[PDB]
Each structure stands twice: as structure tokens, then as C-alpha cells.
Design a protein around this ligand. Structure first.
Ligand SMILES: COC(=O)[C@@H](NC(=O)CNC(=O)[C@H](CS)NCc1ccc(-c2ccccc2)cc1)C(C)C
Ligand SMILES: COC(=O)[C@@H](NC(=O)CNC(=O)[C@H](CS)NCc1ccc(-c2ccccc2)cc1)C(C)C
Ligand SMILES: [Ca+2]
Ligand SMILES: [Ca+2]
Ligand SMILES: [Ca+2]
Ligand SMILES: [Ca+2]
Ligand SMILES: [Ca+2]
Ligand SMILES: [Ca+2]
Ligand SMILES: [Zn+2]
Ligand SMILES: [Zn+2]
Ligand SMILES: [Zn+2]
Ligand SMILES: [Zn+2]
Lengths: 167, 167
């Protein structure tokens, strides 16, 4: 499609419109926070929070129909979805609350999905690499700590904003 | 990113918002109806034009910044672009008037481009295959009234809507 969806800006906001039941809000703010950070660490993109008003990336929690062309389908199949850079609905990320969000590995871990969604919200498509973050099918890490941006994710995203240096 | 990006209804609507100085208005209307037919003949879908109100596929001619994340670039480079099915901007098609739209093949034939574009509006993607309607690089083609779909495009479209009811 004519033009790689990418922020022509470097300083981006987000607004966590609401929170899931499955976790303590402070657990959700973190996930959302580290997830943003994995992209801050490998590029010059910087992100600020909004507690009102339309933000680039509006994060939220939904179920079934919820305002956009892609309803959720209950437990399983789709876990979330995000939209590439642009005005309005673009940049956004929605998580299906019919999935169980976790800080750990009990099932669907928020940090991990969130982190993949921001890839999309930044301009990343899926990768065909079994080890990468933008791979289309979710996979859980017995140990959250050994978590890293496969160098497949890093280039991909850098090919869009470049290395950290601050552009 | 995730989720089958097709219209869920077969009866899609469309509107020509405005025209190009380049060619008579009936030219443009006709290049557009054929564009639509190129896809009627190979699927179930049906189109009906509107002369007011918001339509699925909003068709218009523009230049440079014109209401979306992707302003046009002047003569050459990009000629048009269109959006997958869904709400608002989704489904619309836009034509860079910095280009010179022609009935024949002296310049950039409205029909061929319109044909490619509707395809996007319908959910199709660009091609790797080189003899198809979706290959990213445009090319003039005489005889027009005897235009045909490649199998790639054919396979592209039916993967989404199937064969025309039509036995
Ligand atoms: C519980 O998982 C599921 O039921 C099913 N769904 C998915 O994974 C669907 N994919 C989706 O719902 C979306 C499309 S944007 N991707 C979310 C997602 C989130 C995280 C990772 C991930 C990748 C590598 C390491 C760690 C995590 C991968 C994908 C199936 C895999 C069976
Ligand atoms: C370098 O490519 C080019 O020369 C041309 N530029 C492009 O093609 C760039 N493309 C674009 O703006 C859009 C992307 S959405 N491509 C529209 C398009 C329309 C019709 C066909 C086509 C294919 C096969 C047979 C007949 C026609 C192919 C592409 C023109 C500037 C002359
Ligand atoms: Ca947004
Ligand atoms: Ca689901
Ligand atoms: Ca839940
Ligand atoms: Ca142009
Ligand atoms: Ca539309
Ligand atoms: Ca023109
Ligand atoms: Zn959604
Ligand atoms: Zn994804
Ligand atoms: Zn446009
Ligand atoms: Zn195209």
C-alpha cells in the first residue's frame, strides 16, 4: 500500500481508556509501560500518557462487538488486534476481555500481547520467524525475564524509525 | 492486521464525489462502472451508485494533502491508493489529479487504475506475480474493452468472496 504506515512524529501519546477485571490496575499500567519501552529501547520514539482526550494510541479492553469492523470472538482465536499509524482509530490497540490477562504465564500474559500490539501500533506487520515478537501466533515464556526483541523485531522496527540516537 | 478483511455484505454501494478536469465526466463514470464490473464478473458482489450520503466506496479525485494519512505526491510516483473494507475511510478510493487520466493509453487510463483500486477496496493486496491487475507497477494496455483478470487476481478475489453464484 502506498506508503509504510509510520508516525511522521517521534513523540507519541497513549490513553488507557479502561481496565480489565483480570488484573489490578497497577498490573495493567506496568504491562502497558514495559510494552511501550521495548520499542523505546530500540528506536527514538518517545511516549507520553494522557488521562483524557484522544491520544495516538488509545489502549482499551473489549468483548464481542465494540465499535470497529472487527468484533472479538470470545475465548480463543483472537487475543487482541491493533491498528497501524494514522488518525482516529489507527494506532489503537484493543484487548479481548474474554481472554484471561495475567502478569505471569497462567495463560495469556498482558505484557507479551501488548508488546506485539504496539509493534502494529507503530507499523509492524507479522514476521514469519518462529522466534520473533511480531510472529502471528502467541507463545508463552516460562520465564518472563528471558524475553528479548528477536533481532527480527529489532531491524523491522528500526527499518521504520532507526536506532536509538533520537531522530 | 489479524481478521479476514472483506465486506460482510455482498451489496456494496459507492459514490463519485467529484471529477477530474482531464476527461469528460461520462468518461470517468464509465471507467468506474467497468472497474466495478471487472469484479462483478468474477464474484457474487453487486454495486449500486449513490448521489448523496456516505457510501462504502467513496470515489474522488485529489492532489497533495487531501484528508488522510497519505497526501499525494505530484505528477508520477504514486497514482492512487485505496483502503480495505470497513467503516469511514475504509473502502474509499482516491485519485491523484496530478496524473493525466485518459480513456486510451496516452497517459494513465482511469479504468485500469480504477480496476486495481476497487480490488483494494474489496480486500485484495498487491502482487508479486507480474502479469496481474494487482502487481504494484502500472502499465498501459490497449484493446481495453477486452480486458481480463489474471488467475492470480482471480484466485486473490475468490479466496475472499468465492465464485459468482452463477452456474
Ligand atoms: C491463546 O492463543 C490463541 O488461542 C490463539 N491466537 C493467537 O495467538 C492469535 N494472534 C493474535 O491474536 C494477534 C494478532 S495481532 N497476535 C497476538 C500475539 C501476542 C503475543 C505474541 C507473542 C509472540 C512471541 C512471543 C510472545 C508472544 C504473538 C501474538 C492461537 C495462537 C491458537
Ligand atoms: C514505477 O511505476 C510506475 O511507473 C507507475 N507508478 C506505479 O505504478 C505506482 N503505483 C500506484 O500508485 C498504485 C499502488 S496502489 N498502483 C496502481 C496500479 C493500477 C493498475 C495496475 C495495473 C496492473 C496490471 C495491468 C494494468 C494495470 C497496476 C498498479 C506510474 C508512476 C507510471
Ligand atoms: Ca488513534
Ligand atoms: Ca478471542
Ligand atoms: Ca478477561
Ligand atoms: Ca502522484
Ligand atoms: Ca468508506
Ligand atoms: Ca489531472
Ligand atoms: Zn477492536
Ligand atoms: Zn498481530
Ligand atoms: Zn487519499
Ligand atoms: Zn495497489
Amino acid at each position: 500500500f502506498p506508503g509504510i504506515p509510520k508516525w511522521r512524529k517521534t513523540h507519541l501519546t497513549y490513553r488507557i481508556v479502561n481496565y480489565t477485571p483480570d488484573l489490578p490496575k497497577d498490573a495493567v499500567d506496568s504491562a502497558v509501560e514495559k510494552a511501550l519501552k521495548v520499542w523505546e529501547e530500540v528506536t527514538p520514539l518517545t511516549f507520553s500518557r494522557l488521562y483524557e482526550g484522544e491520544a495516538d494510541i488509545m489502549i482499551s479492553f473489549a468483548v464481542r462487538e465494540h465499535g470497529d469492523f472487527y468484533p472479538f470472538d470470545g475465548p480463543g482465536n483472537v487475543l487482541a488486534h491493533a491498528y497501524a499509524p494514522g488518525p482516529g482509530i489507527n494506532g489503537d490497540a484493543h484487548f479481548d476481555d474474554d481472554e484471561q490477562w495475567t502478569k505471569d504465564t497462567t495463560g495469556t500474559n498482558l505484557f507479551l500481547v501488548a508488546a506485539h500490539q504496539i509493534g502494529h501500533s507503530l507499523g509492524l506487520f507479522h514476521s514469519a520467524n518462529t522466534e520473533a515478537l511480531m510472529y502471528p501466533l502467541y507463545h508463552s515464556l516460562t520465564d518472563l525475564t528471558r524475553f528479548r526483541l528477536s533481532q527480527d523485531d529489532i531491524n523491522g522496527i528500526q527499518s521504520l524509525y532507526g536506532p536509538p540516537p533520537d531522530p
